[PDB]
């Protein structure tokens, strides 16, 4: 050991990336802090209960417009998973999957319930 002898390491806290931890921090608290919580309890639950009501009548036209509305407002709130639910909702309407539609309506209801 005359040349290389001994090293401390090779990179020394380098060549690493702390780009872990995906979605999930305090998004609901963030939306509360911004003040958009007012909207969250204004038109959102109204569209949700309407979703339920229009689903009962099987008014896919109204289901679609509200799914798109929710997709837009969730995208506005920057809620990706929420907008995703609305995305699948519109797809379920296109496929005429009634049980799927109501399932996702319930999933959005449960979603909104936990975020409210």
Curated annotation (Swiss-Prot):
The chain holds residues 775 to 890 of 890 of the full protein. The gene is rcsD. Interacts with RcsC and RcsB. Has a higher affinity for RcsB than for RcsC. It is found in: Cell inner membrane. It comes from Escherichia coli (strain K12). Phosphorylated by RcsC. Component of the Rcs signaling system, which controls transcription of numerous genes. RcsD is a phosphotransfer intermediate between the sensor kinase RcsC and the response regulator RcsB. It acquires a phosphoryl group from RcsC and transfers it to RcsB. The system controls expression of genes involved in colanic acid capsule synthesis, biofilm formation and cell division. This is Phosphotransferase RcsD. The modification Phosphohistidine is found at residue 68. Belongs to the RcsD family. Residues 29-116 form the HPt domain.
């Amino acid at each position: 050991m005359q040349e290389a002898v001994l090293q401390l390491i090779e990179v020394q806290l380098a060549q690493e990336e702390v780009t872990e931890s995906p979605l999930g921090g305090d998004e609901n608290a963030q939306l509360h802090a911004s003040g958009y919580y007012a909207l969250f309890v204004d038109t959102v639950p109204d569209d949700v209960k309407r979703l339920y009501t229009e689903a009962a009548t099987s008014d896919f036209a109204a289901l679609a417009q509200t799914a798109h509305r929710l997709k837009g407002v969730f995208a506005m709130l920057n809620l990706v998973p929420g907008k995703q639910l609305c995305e699948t909702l519109e797809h379920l309407i296109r496929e005429k999957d009634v049980p799927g539609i109501e399932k996702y309506i319930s999933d959005i209801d449960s979603y909104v319930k936990s975020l409210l």
